[PDB]
Design a binder for these strands. Sequence first.
DNA 1: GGGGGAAGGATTCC
DNA 2: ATGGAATCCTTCCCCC
Length: 341
Amino acid sequence: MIVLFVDFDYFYAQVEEVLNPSLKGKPVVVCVFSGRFEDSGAVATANYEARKFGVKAGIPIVEAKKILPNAVYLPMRKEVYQQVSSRIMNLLREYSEKIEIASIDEAYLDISDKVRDYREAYNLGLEIKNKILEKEKITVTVGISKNKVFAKIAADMAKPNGIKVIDDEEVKRLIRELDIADVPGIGNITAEKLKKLGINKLVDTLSIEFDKLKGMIGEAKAKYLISLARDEYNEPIRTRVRKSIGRIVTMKRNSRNLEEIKPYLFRAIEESYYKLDKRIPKAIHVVAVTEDLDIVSRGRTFPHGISKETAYSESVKLLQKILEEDERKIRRIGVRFSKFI
DNA sequence: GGGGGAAGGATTCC
DNA sequence: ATGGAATCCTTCCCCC
Ligand SMILES: Nc1ncnc2c1ncn2[C@H]1C[C@H](O)[C@@H](COP(=O)(O)OP(=O)(O)OP(=O)(O)O)O1
Ligand SMILES: [Ca+2]
Ligand SMILES: [Ca+2]
Ligand SMILES: [Ca+2]
């Protein structure tokens, strides 16, 4: 089975460059302003020009300006990048019937019933890159292999504006050479739990006794890794379906006062419902980020669909349950709707 | 013993 | 140090 993974380069930033090519060449940082103080907030992402100096996704905007004070700082326009994304996805949908849209700028393609060996995959890779570039002026990285996981890893290795093939032969080498902290789905937490287990490479999972793994990282994560290590990982590409919709906003100041939070919560609801569009949810969760950036939530599933009125009343109840079940001051507050009928 | 759910949390990642 | 969403884990619960 051959998988071709497509990942758009510094997406949010590259799009801002697209909508105003005068930006190209200069440091571009797309920010998410929390509105607590002048430049409060974090970086959604930045182009390589700015990234070469440490300015990247996740760091505070203030930390970015202290490094590249003259870089161009733009507020994140999620709706725009989303529409540009869709168009490009449709484009891909023409190279394969089998398409999995992993994120706002990622997608795996099953080109098995469309290609023989990796040579034809490579060409198709370029042919697609070219297409997208000519159609939307967007550069992307392409990764190809026997399964999704490796297809992705291939792309990571070739970023940016790259293309790479990881044939069954190299797959063997990486299962021994690849740091397992570079295996998708393995973050710092799992990384350190694997380090304390002597597993630095994928193959190291082969030594360890299963039951021991399942206990340190979990059965699912355990079986996952073992499969990859056995060169037997082989999940299929399938259409993903939006399972939840919601919004969470940062409050000007941190509160613990019901009446002070409410307005923020109601706004999260309103927008959430607009995003629902046609969807009617049976479950609603109130999510709160406490002063010490911890995340607390409370929810409830109804035996029917939830109307905006019902979400309003219930939301206030769930918030109250949070204020009385936790002592910390609430920093961010929002809602999450799920279990669509 | 074990088949569901539901709830709250933990992890990862785009 | 923003904000959106899937997945998986543990625990509690109801009951055959
Ligand atoms: N921490 C984050 N906060 C908000 N948005 C994020 C964050 N991390 C990633 N994103 C969003 C914006 C990114 O452009 C987008 C698409 O893919 P992603 O791999 O995450 O970044 P990117 O487009 O810059 O990738 P690349 O390294 O190839 O440039 O996901
Ligand atoms: Ca990308
Ligand atoms: Ca990506
Ligand atoms: Ca990692």
